[PDB]
Structures are given as C-alpha cells and as structure tokens.
C-alpha cells in the first residue's frame, strides 16, 4: 500500500532481513495499535452511547411524545365530550339570555364615563397628589395607582378606545372623549405626574421607606401590569399574527386585502377580531392597560434620575479639575441606596438594581470627558479617573465605577511629560555637573579615597525614582518600560555627554599638565587645571555604579507585579547598562592613563635614545607612574580599576615602546640599550608590582605584557640568529603588532642588515600571514593593536 511500502520503510528501518528487529518492530506497531485502540475503544464507546441515548430518546419521544400530543388526543379529544352537554341546566339560556344582558353595559358606561369624567377631574388633583411628598403623594400606591386604575377604567378610553374602534355607535368614543379629556389624560398623566413625581420623589435621597414603597409599588404594579398589558396587545398582534395571519395570511385569500391587511395584517379588525386577543373573553380583559409609564416606560427615568442626577453632578469644569465623579459617584452611592431601597420597595419594576450600573455609565462617561484632552491636570489626569475606576469599583460590586478607556492615551501624555521633563532635568543636571568638574581643586561628595558620589546624578537617582512612581504606581507596560527605556535613550545622551565633557576634563588636565611640567607653550583658556582629575572621573564611575544602585537595584527591586516579559522589557535597558556603568570608564579612565602621563613626556621618547640607556628616565617613568598608581589605587572603583591598571601596564608598555622608529642604532653594542631592556627591566618591574598591592594582579594583569617585554627583549636586543624565534613566539601571542615592527627594529639597528631582514623578517612575514591563516584561524589586538611600525622596502 501507499502506507505499507512506507511502513516497509519503517520496518526497513530494521535492516533488510531483520527477524529479531522485525519482531520488535512488530511490537512497536502493537504499541501504536494498542493505544490507538484504547482511545478508539473508549471514544467509540462514548459515540455508541450517544447513539444509544439518541435513538433512545427518538424512541422515547416518538412514542411517548406521540402519546403526549396523542395524550392531547386523549385529554383534548376528551375536551370534545361535553361540548353541548355540560353544567346540567339551561346553559343555552345562560349564554344567550343571561349573557344577553352582558351585552347591556350601557348605564355603567354612562355613570362610569360620566363619573370617569368628573371623578378623574377630581383625581386630576386627588389621585395626582403632590406637593411635596407626604410619602410621595401622599401614598402614591393609593394616589398614583388610583390614577392607574382610574386610567385602567379610562383604559376603556385609552386601550379599549383602541378596542372599541367603531363597535356599534359613534359617540361611544366621541361624547365620552370629552368625558375622557378629564377622564383619560387626567388619570393616565395623573399617574404620570404621580409616576414622574413618584420616581422623582424616589429620586429624593431617602426616598423614602414609605414614599418609594408606595410610589415604587405603584410603579411596579402598573409597570409590570402595563408590560403584560401592552404585551397582551402586542400579543394581540402576535396572537393575531398567530391567528388572523393564519386566516388572512393562510395563504388562501389570496390577494390578500386592500387596504386593512398588509398593512395591518395581522391586527386585524377591532371589536373583536382585532381586540378580543386583548379583550373579552378574555379573563383580563382590557388588556389592563395601566399605566404605560408608571415605571414600564419610567424606570429609565429612575436609573436615569441617578444617571441624570449623576450625569448632572459632573459640573463639567471639573470644579477643581476632576471632581465630576465626586458628586457623580456620590449619586452612584445614592444610586446603590435608591436601587436596593427600591428593590426592597418594588420587585417587578421601578429601579430594582440598574441604578448602580446606570450610574456607572454616569461615572464612566463622566470620567471619560473631564480629562479627555489635556484640559485637566495632566499630571493628575489618569490618577483621578483611575482612582475612581478601581476605588469606585471597590465601593460597589466591582460596580458603580468609572470605566475610562482614556487611561492609556493619558499615559501617553505622561510619557511625553516625564520624558521631555527628564530631557530638561538631565540636560541641566549634566551641564551643572561638568561645569563643577572643571574646578579642579575640590572633589565632589566627601570621601578621602575617591569613591565620591555626585549631586545632580543624585537628583537623577532619587528624583527620577520619584518620576517613576506613576510608572510603577500604575504598572504600565508602556511607561514603566517606555519612560524607562526612552529614559535609557536619555541615558545614552547622558553617557555621550560624559564622553564629551569628560573628554574636556581630559583636555583640561592635558593642558594643565602642559602648565605643570610639559613645556607650557600650549595654554588654553578652559584648561587652568592642576592634578586632581582622578577623583572627578572615578566619582563619575562611582555614580555609574550608583546608577546601578537605583537604576539596576531599584529596577529589579520593585518591578515584580507583571510577568517576566514586561519586567524583562524594563530589564533590557536598565541592567545591561552595568557594562555601560563602566563604558564612561572606557572613555574617562583611559584619559586617566594619559593623565598619569602628561607631566612626563620628556622621558617618554628619550627612551630608545642614549640618555635613558644609562640614566634616570626609567626612574621618572617607573617610579613617578608607580606613585601615580599609589594615589589612584585608594581612590578607584573596582570595575574601573581592574580594566584600568590592566590598561596602565599595557598603555605604559606602549609608552615604553614609543621610540622604535627614531632609528637610533641599538646599544646592545656595549649593552647600554640591553641593560635598558634588562636592568631597567628591574625598574620596569615594580611599575607592575608596586603599582599593584592589595591584590595579586602584580603580574597577573602584567603577564600578557611580560610577553611583549621578554619577547621584545628578543626582538630589539638580540642579534641575527635570535630575532627569528623572537617573531616565532612573539607571533604566537602578538600578531596585532605585525612583522614590520622588526623592520623598525632593523631601522634602529645597523649590525643586523637588510638582507638579513629579508630572510628573517620576510620568511617571518610568511610566518605572520600564513600563521594568521594557521593559528589565528594568535590572540586579540591589545596594547600592541595598531602599532605596526613603518616598513622600508622589505
């Protein structure tokens, strides 16, 4: 098969004739079919039982439900038994003679249409009672619901005026219509003056334990009675749409009609084809239809009386800047009290519990406009509406709260504010600091061993720590990252300015040392600047490490209530900066190494000439720079220090290998240069091992440079047949300084000639490049990185 030949490959992953591994491979197939039949077993069982209940209930309802509608053949065909038999008496004279006077409702319509005129003219004040509450009307379950039933007796002139639509006469709704002017709208609007003044009376801060009880009881009685009443009229168009649109829209008319059907199919003709589905008989039977807006259409004015009192309590200024939700959420507390008080009053309607969430539309929509733009206090924009979001949540079910959706755009306003503010802050703090550091007689914040902290950087520390209190205070993935990481771009502008003006500190000590001991024909205006750059630039690296303290240590110290993704998005650009927290040391402290130097450039090129060969130039270099690392040594930050003295032994050996191209013929002749490589090697040893005390770097960060010491002793002292292996070994460590240095060494030498430079130094050039294909495919550029000295014609 197309699987089996592939399965012949799967078992042909056992060999070709592999009967033991064919057996085991068959056991693997048995494991696969084993579990596939466990899950296919139980899954097939669940499907089978689903078919079992499926056909079991298709059975049970085919038979039993066929005997449920056929049990309606049993009991409903039993309904047809006593159709013209029952009630053992003159039922024919009960439904056609005693019920003939049921078609004789004349005098009740005259004294009740007339009494509906006069007494509801009286109930236009009595059942429309107000001024002020006295329990809301007084007693609007007596009063406003007396206007509801007086409007339900005038629902003969309001709802059964729509049932009596040309029943038998013309003045049943005309001469009684002036009896319905003071009859219907002096009872229905009396129940709506008592209903709008009931719910308005229920909008009156208590409101009350009997006022909202009676008033809301009328506004649930005539509210839900109105709901089933107009639901019985809409179910007279839906029971007529069920009934007359099963008659007119059978379809067997089949025109259908013009124009009392489609439209109004199906209503369809009042009294009684359009009425008796809401009228007699009809054990209701009007439908009621009181009161329409007791709270059937007037419960929206209660939750919109706390959501129009709430929305009215905004006072859109916001009366300090965001006090809209103060009085508005106060009306939300009155919405919870009026809500639960009214559900204690009225179960069916009249503000059961919707006043709370309607007032959450009042506080939500209210707080989403007081700080829509930056028109409120932009520093206090999201804290107010968010404080009412979570607090007005916690003041309720959490839920008459302030849903805002403008939190995050206002957090972009906090982005622009805190970022551009910290551009202003950071710029002033920088230029203040650097203009302090050019005053080189007093160091910053006191300690006598150069571990000084700073002042404006402390304002960055503590005061930017206070800038991110809204960041961590609201736990934003867009500010506590974004102000922090855009702030890290601001820190990149910082360390660029520490490179710039700390390089101007370097220039200041360069020409101040020109003023000190270096031939004073160099003097600049801003460089009147003696020794003392040590405490300044190390004070910088110290608050690089204290930017590690509050930036790194506060960073991972507080930010622990997101996942490590967003916490990590913070962590990408505050704590890799530890390398950055010596990267200024990549630019400051190398300047320190040259400013240990710049009082001493008179021996720095008189090396390789005859003065240093038997004199005290090595004394000045080694001992003076030794003391220069006998005062930076107490005064230096550690991460700056290891890299520092490392680059002191390195840079001081390349200032010990400065003058390899001055072409002074080497005094290995009478050993004057050679003692300058050997006896001065003792003097240039405690420049490595008295510079370094308190640690064991004395040769450890000097061994790599004893390579260029001893192999350079093999380069520049030794004769013809001992400069080959000089470039062998010196190639085996330092190919960064290339072969042509030896050419300069044979520029500084007569008694190893230029054809010897061809054989030794050019076959050794082939050693250099072919070993660079061989062994470098030695180590990095170093102190001897780009000191490939000039070569002649090989």
């Amino acid at each position: 098969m197309s699987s089996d030949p592939l399965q012949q490959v799967c078992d042909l992953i056992k060999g070709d004739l592999s009967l033991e591994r064919v057996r085991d491979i068959k056991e693997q197939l048995l494991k696969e079919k084993s579990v596939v039949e466990y899950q296919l077993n139980k899954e097939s069982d669940k499907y089978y039982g689903e078919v079992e209940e499926s056909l079991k209930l298709l059975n049970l309802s085919k038979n039993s439900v066929t005997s449920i509608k056929q049990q309606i053949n049993e009991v409903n065909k039993l309904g047809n038994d006593n159709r013209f038999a029952i009630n053992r008496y003159d039922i024919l004279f009960r439904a056609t003679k005693l019920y003939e006077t049921v078609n004789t409702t004349s005098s009740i319509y005259d004294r009740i249409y007339n009494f509906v005129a006069l007494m509801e003219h009286i109930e236009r004040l009595l059942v429309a009672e107000l001024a002020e509450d006295a329990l809301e009307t007084g007693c609007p379950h007596l009063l406003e619901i007396h206007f509801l039933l007086t409007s339900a007796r005038d629902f003969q002139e309001q709802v059964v005026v729509m049932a009596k639509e040309a029943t038998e006469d013309a003045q049943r709704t005309v001469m009684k219509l002036f009896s319905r002017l003071s009859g219907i709208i002096s009872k229905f609007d009396k129940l709506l003056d008592g209903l709008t003044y009931d719910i308005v009376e229920m909008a009156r801060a208590e409101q009350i334990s009997l006022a909202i009880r009676l008033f809301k009881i009328y506004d649930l009685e005539e509210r839900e009675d109105l709901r089933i009443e107009a639901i019985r009229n809409i179910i007279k168009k839906k029971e007529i749409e069920i009934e007359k649109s099963s008659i007119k829209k059978l379809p067997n008319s089949k025109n259908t009609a013009r124009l009392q059907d489609e439209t109004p199919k199906v209503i369809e003709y009042p009294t009684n084809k359009g009425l008796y589905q809401e009228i007699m008989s009809g054990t209701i039977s009007t439908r009621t239809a009181p009161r329409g807006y007791k709270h059937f259409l007037i419960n929206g004015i209660n939750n919109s009386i706390s959501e129009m009192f709430g929305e009215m309590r905004e006072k859109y200024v916001g009366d300090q800047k965001f006090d809209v939700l103060d009085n508005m959420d106060w009306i939300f507390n009155e919405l919870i009290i009026v809500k639960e008080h009214i559900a204690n009053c009225c179960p069916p309607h009249w503000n059961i519990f919707e006043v709370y969430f309607d007032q959450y539309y009042k506080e939500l929509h209210s707080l989403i406009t007081d700080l829509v733009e930056s028109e409120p206090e932009t520093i206090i924009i999201l804290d107010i509406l968010a404080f009412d979001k979570t607090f007005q949540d916690t003041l309720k079910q959490d839920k008459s709260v302030i849903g805002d959706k403008e939190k995050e755009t206002l957090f972009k306003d906090y982005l622009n504010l805190i970022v551009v503010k910290m551009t202003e802050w950071i710029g002033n703090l920088e230029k203040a600091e650097f203009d302090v550091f050019l005053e080189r007689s007093t160091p910053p914040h006191s300690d006598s061993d150069g571990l000084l902290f700073l002042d404006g950087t402390k304002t960055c520390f503590q005061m930017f720590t206070q800038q991110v209190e809204v960041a961590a205070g609201t736990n934003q993935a867009k500010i506590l990252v974004g102000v922090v990481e855009r702030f890290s771009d601001l820190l990149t502008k910082r360390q660029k300015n520490w490179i710039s003006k700390i390089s101007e500190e370097i220039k200041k000590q360069i020409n101040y040392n020109h003023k000190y001991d270096i031939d004073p024909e160099s003097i600049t205006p801003e460089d009147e600047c003696p020794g003392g750059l040590v405490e300044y630039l190390i004070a910088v690296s110290n608050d690089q490490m204290k930017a590690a303290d509050y930036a790194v240590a506060i960073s991972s110290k507080y930010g622990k209530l997101v996942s490590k993704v967003y916490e990590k998005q913070i962590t990408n650009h505050l704590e890799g900066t530890l390398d950055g927290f010596a990267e200024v040391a990549q630019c400051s402290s190398l300047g320190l190494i040259t400013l240990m130097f710049d009082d001493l450039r008179k021996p720095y090129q008189e090396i390789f000439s005859k003065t240093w060969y038997m004199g005290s130039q090595a004394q000045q270099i080694a001992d003076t720079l030794d003391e220069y690392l006998l005062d930076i040594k107490p005064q230096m930050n550690s991460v700056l220090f290891v890299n520092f003295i490392d680059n002191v032994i390195g840079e001081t050996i390349i200032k010990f290998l400065t003058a390899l191209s001055f072409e002074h013929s080497f005094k290995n002749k009478n050993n004057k240069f050679l003692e300058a490589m050997k006896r001065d090697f003792e003097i240039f040893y405690q420049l490595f091992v008295k510079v370094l005390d308190g640690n064991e770097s004395k040769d450890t960060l000097i061994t790599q440079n004893f390579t260029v010491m001893e192999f350079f002793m093999d380069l520049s002292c030794e004769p013809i047949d001992s400069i080959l292996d000089i470039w062998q070994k010196y190639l085996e460590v330092y190919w960064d300084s290339r072969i042509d240095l030896l050419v300069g060494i044979l520029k500084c030498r007569k008694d190893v000639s230029s054809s010897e430079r061809k054989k030794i130094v050019q076959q050794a050039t082939e050693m250099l490049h072919e070993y660079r294909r061989n062994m470098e495919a030695d180590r990095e550029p170093t102190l001897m990185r780009r000191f490939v000295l000039e070569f002649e014609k090989q």
Partner: protein, 49 residues
C-alpha cells in the same frame, strides 16, 4: 500476496525459494527414479526384492 518487491527481505528470500524448489525436484526425481525400479532394490540400491 505481499509484493514486496523488493529487498528488504523479499526479494532475496525468493532465490532460495525457487532454487529450493528445483532442489526438491532434484531429490524428488531422485527418489522417484530410485526405486522406479530403474535402479533395482526395494529402494534404489539397498537390495531387498
């Protein structure tokens, strides 16, 4: 049935199959022409008459 077609083990079973079958026609006509009695015995040549 399984053809199979090819190596792994079938084919390179079928060599010893078909040559084992001509080996059984070899031993078959050996015992057939043994006491055919084209060699005479009870057997080919173990004389019992």
């Amino acid at each position: 049935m399984n053809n199979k077609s090819l190596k792994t083990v079938e084919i390179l079973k079928p060599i010893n199959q078909q040559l084992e079958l001509q080996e059984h026609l070899l031993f078959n006509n050996l015992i057939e022409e043994i006491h055919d009695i084209m060699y005479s015995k009870s057997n080919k040549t173990n004389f019992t008459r």
